[PDB]
Amino acid sequence: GKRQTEREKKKKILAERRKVLAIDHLNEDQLREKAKELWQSIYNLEAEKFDLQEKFKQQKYEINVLRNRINDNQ
Template identity: 60%
Template sequence: MEKDLTELQTLIEAHFESRKKDEEELINITQWIENRRGERAEQHRTRTEREKERQNKLAEEKARKEEEEAKRKADDDAKKKKVLTSFQCTGFMQRTDKRGGPKKQTEREKKKTILSERRKELNVENLSADKLRETVNKLWKSMRQLEAEKFELQYRYMCQKYEITILRNRVSDHQKNTKGSRSKRGLRK
């Protein structure tokens, strides 16, 4: 009996010791979980702060780029206006004299000079309604005339292009025929 009693006591002590160890492990695990939660919360907070900073930087960069783009466009517009006013104020011969004689012009420059010579300033500030209607009708008629000329030129261009392709085909056919007749002549001799 005593033997059973001592064995039972050792089992009870072993059980309480293992339970004590389990409780200590449980306490350690809960502390680790709490620490980990705190670390994750801190990481999440720093991550959100970094994201906010990044978004702010991107917004500032975008605003800066838009501002630079607006400044660049304003500068380009100012340069264009300056060039156009210089085209309007001076004639072609005056500009070539200043440069030291006529120089070759690019197609763009030619177009600009032609347009500046054709373009007339409209002073519509002091005109009455009837005069405005007259000027609008004149502009409309001139625009219709220009559109008609444009259509005629396009039609003539298409006809000429068609004729050129026909002539090219005839030339190539003629060359093929002459090559074939030459080779046949060489075989007969």
């Protein structure tokens, strides 16, 4: 049963980062700068993702390399 909760926590971990946004107390000009901060968040996110991707690639090579070692000292 804990594994089902683990999948639920995976969705819950995605859920935690999102929070309610309020557009009623803001005026016309402020909303624009606030939109920009949302945009920078987007930017930031992709950057880390990109990093991970590149690391993933690197890590895969590692795996390959590692496999060869067990195929040379067996």
